[PDB]
Design an enzyme around this catalytic site. Sequence first.
Site, PDB file in Angstrom:
ATOM      1  N   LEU A   1       0.823  -1.210   0.000  1.00  0.00           N
ATOM      2  CA  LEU A   1       0.000   0.000   0.000  1.00  0.00           C
ATOM      3  C   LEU A   1       0.857   1.259   0.000  1.00  0.00           C
ATOM      4  CD1 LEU A   1      -2.383   1.951   0.530  1.00  0.00           C
ATOM      5  CD2 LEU A   1      -2.296   1.266   2.926  1.00  0.00           C
ATOM      6  N   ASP A   2       1.732   1.347   0.991  1.00  0.00           N
ATOM      7  CA  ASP A   2       2.591   2.497   1.149  1.00  0.00           C
ATOM      8  C   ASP A   2       3.744   2.075   2.037  1.00  0.00           C
ATOM      9  OD1 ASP A   2       3.815   4.876   1.814  1.00  0.00           O
ATOM     10  OD2 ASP A   2       2.134   5.631   3.003  1.00  0.00           O
TER      11      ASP A   2
END
Lengths: 449, 449
Positions: free
Chosen positions: B124-125
Amino acid sequence: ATKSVLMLGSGFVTRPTLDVLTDSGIKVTVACRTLESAKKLSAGVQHSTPISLDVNDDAALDAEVAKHDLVISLIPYTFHATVIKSAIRQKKHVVTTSYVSPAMMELDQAAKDAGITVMNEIGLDPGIDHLYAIKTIEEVHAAGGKIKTFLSYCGGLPAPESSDNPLGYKFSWSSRGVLLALRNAASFYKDGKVTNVAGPELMATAKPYFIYPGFAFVAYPNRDSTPYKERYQIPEADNIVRGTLRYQGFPQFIKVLVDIGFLSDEEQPFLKEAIPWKEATQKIVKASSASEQDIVSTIVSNATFESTEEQKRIVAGLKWLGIFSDKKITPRGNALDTLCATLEEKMQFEEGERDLVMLQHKFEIENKDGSRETRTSSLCEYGAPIGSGGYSAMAKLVGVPCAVAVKFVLDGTISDRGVLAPMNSKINDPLMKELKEKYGIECKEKVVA
Amino acid sequence: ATKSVLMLGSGFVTRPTLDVLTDSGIKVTVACRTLESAKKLSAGVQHSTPISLDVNDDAALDAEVAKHDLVISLIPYTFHATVIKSAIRQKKHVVTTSYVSPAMMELDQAAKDAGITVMNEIGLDPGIDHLYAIKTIEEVHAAGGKIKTFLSYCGGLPAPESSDNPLGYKFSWSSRGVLLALRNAASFYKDGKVTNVAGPELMATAKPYFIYPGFAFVAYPNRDSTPYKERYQIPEADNIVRGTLRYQGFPQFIKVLVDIGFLSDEEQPFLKEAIPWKEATQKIVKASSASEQDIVSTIVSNATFESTEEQKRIVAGLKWLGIFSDKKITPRGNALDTLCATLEEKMQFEEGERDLVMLQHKFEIENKDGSRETRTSSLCEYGAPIGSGGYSAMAKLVGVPCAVAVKFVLDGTISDRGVLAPMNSKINDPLMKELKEKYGIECKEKVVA
């Protein structure tokens, strides 16, 4: 052997109420000024009979009322409403989601004489909120406690993920009144005294109101909450407020609209012709040119901002509405109405989005022993996504309680005749029980230091 | 082309990855520190094989790695060098969702010499964020525009309705780290220069960060975003910040813990023996009486509050945690570790609750024609309720991108050899297309201009 009901449908709320009534074996005849409206609003449900009907027509309505056992009115009640008077004449029962007004209270005696029950204030608010406000108060008083402050705020908003527009608000009707009712006055109890606030400060009192970390709410008081010291029987309370919830930024944007003359309904010569927004705004705002720079500079000179970043966002929000553009306005004789035409068009719930209802009561309590505690009663719910065919939280929480009411008036669970509201355990207990156990609709109580 | 993968599992994000790979016909061997946990994850999942494995055992690791085509390291970033060294001897591919650390980069050449692809930062990040940041940056550069400022904030939090706890945060692992974040230093680009904020005052930086009216977010910068001037190839950007999102109140609660010393590391003797909180806290706060009355008046004397209202809410929060109660603690040495213990227990996702992933990039652009605009790229998702069989947002957004990357490295879509990251359109475009078309995962662009 089967009770029938006349439902004066009104948008969203209609489906839920209809579904609950038709499922309980009740015949419902959905009426709308348009037949097609009633048909698409009554499709998919058994025992449904759609028809065309003008409520503004005495004889037409009076004639339809007699054909059924009870009239449900989901239409915002007006001083000019034959609905109840007609039910009296026909000795038929009534259920509305409207507030009991003095005008309506005058019909109480004739309703009793007619032997009919006129149950009102039973939607979400007024409605579910009364049930839980009174419940807690009775519990407290029974334990010898005292309600020092009573606070109640309710907001029908878009889910946070669907709040991305200038007001963090979505419309489904005339924003006509939504906006109008924003510069109204308010009365309530503070420090044990009847405090008042004129419209020219209502949005100025709309301050951040904490409920949950995730949400950014603001709250402002309703027209008048003072009557509730008696209605909720809390003589000992120094603070009593029933109000509304909006998201952060709502007040500031509305305030700027007020300050530049956009909330005026004062008829204007130029606002009844498809002129460019650019030109209409110039006139409303009283700028010297239809230039965006001249309009903005004028607006900034007549508005108030908390910051430059916010000033930039508000100005950006206005531009986004198109009032600085050449796109023609949809004429409505006055600023307010002409702007609403654009708001309504630019801020509708779009497919796949969700609404959200947030209701919360706050009680400052002083126990028998002298202890102090703050209790809350909350109801937070998201509506089904637009287009999925489900109910928006708003339509559900207004339409189900209302449908339960109808059922209780039909089977005698509610038998008091006359003009009523959910103000005592005799009417409220049956309502709360059925809403909680059969539909999961309830407020959750919690204690705090 | 039938293939198999060795997945060094680590929890929640593990499931979506496993489901996707196995639903694609790929055989996955699920390895955990305990065969027990491995079997729970593979339970009923077709083509899955649970095993017990000691990653810290070069021989055992090499042995298992050799039996498959690629190894997915979802365990702590620390074992990554270890895992990649094994993959180099066996000449097997690797995929992680972690940041490429110095140690991993040093193996870049060795990885290329072995002919293997080591794909990292693809969750995701780091992950989805990189893809959409770079995507917009490249579209702007291609049109002749400039990235004057690049802002990116991400938050894995409870949904607003499920955020009602002292921090508006839910833990699923160690609480330590989330509490200390606000005491780390940060480095970023502001107005063209490297700007550093020492841990001591990173706290005063967690200010409100507007995204959507409905949410109440605060944001604070990561340890260092300066390298992104190079990584995203935006030499013209004056402002560059990648950071984290939390809800309102999170900073204030952390600061009170700091001010009273509950974040202390010092190994005290009293906190290694299971004593009641009443005493532990008075010991940590250095108060007289170990009773609320005195412990509370002490905290109020050594901590600051933005308002009496926030004071009451915070004190109630500490009480709600039970640090003022009689029940014993979970002695873990010092205050921080001891306090974390209770936070783990008291603040976790419970039945019916759901998380939220909020990711947003903000771009201040200067077009070729000189005109300036602002662009945001947003991803806002809620997880499935705790109880249903669905994935939380964090798990889905981390695990799916990971699986897609794995498939791509197996079928050759991603053939670049060495230690990689999603930093160019060659890799990102395919990842983005698949994630959007097949899973509906994407950041939506908008022009706040």
